[PDB]
Design a protein around this ligand. Structure first.
Ligand SMILES: NC1=c2[nH]c(=O)n([C@@H]3C[C@@H](O)[C@H](CO)O3)c2=NCN1
Ligand SMILES: NC1=c2[nH]c(=O)n([C@@H]3C[C@@H](O)[C@H](CO)O3)c2=NCN1
Ligand SMILES: NC1=c2[nH]c(=O)n([C@@H]3C[C@@H](O)[C@H](CO)O3)c2=NCN1
Ligand SMILES: NC1=c2[nH]c(=O)n([C@@H]3C[C@@H](O)[C@H](CO)O3)c2=NCN1
Ligand SMILES: *[C@@H]1O[C@H](CO)[C@@H](O)[C@H](O)[C@H]1NC(C)=O
Ligand SMILES: *[C@@H]1O[C@H](CO)[C@@H](O)[C@H](O)[C@H]1NC(C)=O
Ligand SMILES: *[C@@H]1O[C@H](CO)[C@@H](O)[C@H](O)[C@H]1NC(C)=O
Ligand SMILES: *[C@@H]1O[C@H](CO)[C@@H](O)[C@H](O)[C@H]1NC(C)=O
Lengths: 123, 123, 123, 123
């Protein structure tokens, strides 16, 4: 009964939000990612995401990955992590991400990758 | 300087291979990821991948990300990186990945993410 | 805005604790890292750490790195991050770490590095 | 007889060089790190490093960590990895690093960490 499900509306520790739709039988899902300029805030861009959740042993707490294809930049971010629960109740996504910037010369590749985390909860 | 195109067959610094199909107008692509060794032999599994290439400014050396949904484990890997024309003229994908393992308790989350790199050239 | 000083006793989001001593004029410091749980109990090991704080522009919120030389394993961890005065006034260390495991064959190197984060507040 | 030893002069895949001195009985060592501006090259800065190598089971291929306290910036880099050998002969250090930039507001923390690799060989 305690299936952690990616589908729905999520927010995070930096105040970014994401929506993910139905995950099919192969574990594929699409979504949207907002973001989060200045002021507030400032004002919001919306970016597409595509990923897969791992279906091996139809786990209640599966691992997943997804790519955010940023609309306001040449950058790409990948997130990977796991859907947990958590003492009710509360579903939580613990992710790690890599943010790739575009560089012009391959000589600059070494500096093009940031890493960090995101914890997501239901909105 | 012409394009660096993700479509085709690639190999990497650890001897794994990947094939990527056409990238559509939204930057989407599917493919396959063939890995090893674990032997002796018992060699080659084949896992699906799905990703997107960034299209902002229709760059000749775009960034991209993809998720590999492992068939032989509960794990997921995400790659992100950039398609370069190396100094020598050859196309090269410089990537970094995050390999997420499935843990049973959210207390074991801290240890679930490996990181590394992969450099891909055409087969 | 006053200093953010590494010297003192810290705790973190996973319940591990660390003590750091004086930082000398070159930015050097030693300390201790107390971790757990592995139980039941069999609880607390104590491992040495050694690091440096960056002193360029004698910043109030300097960056730093340190290496923890684990006593109970062959592994090494490195932390790096920054000492902030949080919005609430409290000192906080935001860090990222790389946990390197010992492997026997250089063919197993690709899998030897975990990554994550730790947020430290004063005990 | 095949002890991989950190002490000496090393170069890397980006053309940076490092010298490390004697490692004591607790595994501590100091060194220097050059770097590598422009042109060539361009011209070289030299930065101090401090780290430890793990002594548990006096391994022939120990893991280590070290911090580079950059002299020309507010940044800090930590490297961790392992000293291998390799079919002679050839000692090789396979490292992963995190490069922390200084940011002014904790709101900007999420973007302050780059990750990458370095392979080092004897000069
Ligand atoms: N300017 C950019 C950003 N500003 C921001 O809050 N993000 C968020 C924060 C972090 O959740 C995730 C990393 O790519 O995306 C940005 N990504 C990419 N580029
Ligand atoms: N046992 C596993 C592996 N053995 C292997 O070579 N790989 C490769 C190497 C790396 O490209 C990619 C995930 O990092 O998959 C494995 N991934 C996941 N699991
Ligand atoms: N078994 C190990 C551990 N259990 C643990 O809580 N840690 C902590 C968590 C993290 O702060 C730091 C290395 O990542 O050490 C361990 N490190 C290394 N090995
Ligand atoms: N401007 C900077 C650099 N230019 C450079 O080549 N490096 C090198 C490359 C990479 O080996 C290591 C990462 O900090 O240090 C720099 N580090 C830090 N800052
Ligand atoms: C996230 O959604 C919440 C709920 O409506 C909203 O208050 C906030 O504006 C959102 N943040 C962003 C970046 O859109
Ligand atoms: C990768 O491709 C080559 C063909 O060039 C094949 O012979 C090799 O064994 C492949 N490796 C894997 C793991 O499939
Ligand atoms: C950390 O510090 C507290 C004292 O505030 C101590 O009671 C706690 O159990 C410590 N944790 C570890 C792992 O030492
Ligand atoms: C590394 O040392 C070599 C050997 O002398 C030298 O050619 C090169 O100038 C060095 N690179 C840097 C960044 O100092």
């Amino acid at each position: 009964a305690r299936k952690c499900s990616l589908t729905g509306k999520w927010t995070n520790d930096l105040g970014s939000n994401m929506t993910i739709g139905a995950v099919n039988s192969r574990g594929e899902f699409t979504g949207t990612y907002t973001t989060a300029v200045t002021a507030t805030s400032n004002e919001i861009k919306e970016s597409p995401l595509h990923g897969t959740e791992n279906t091996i042993n139809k786990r209640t707490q599966p691992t997943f990955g997804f790519t955010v294809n940023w609309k306001f930049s040449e950058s790409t971010t990948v997130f990977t992590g796991q859907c947990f629960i958590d003492r009710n109740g509360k579903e939580v996504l613990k992710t790690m991400w890599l943010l790739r910037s575009s560089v012009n010369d391959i000589g600059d590749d070494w500096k093009a990758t940031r890493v960090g985390i995101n914890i997501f909860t239901r909105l």
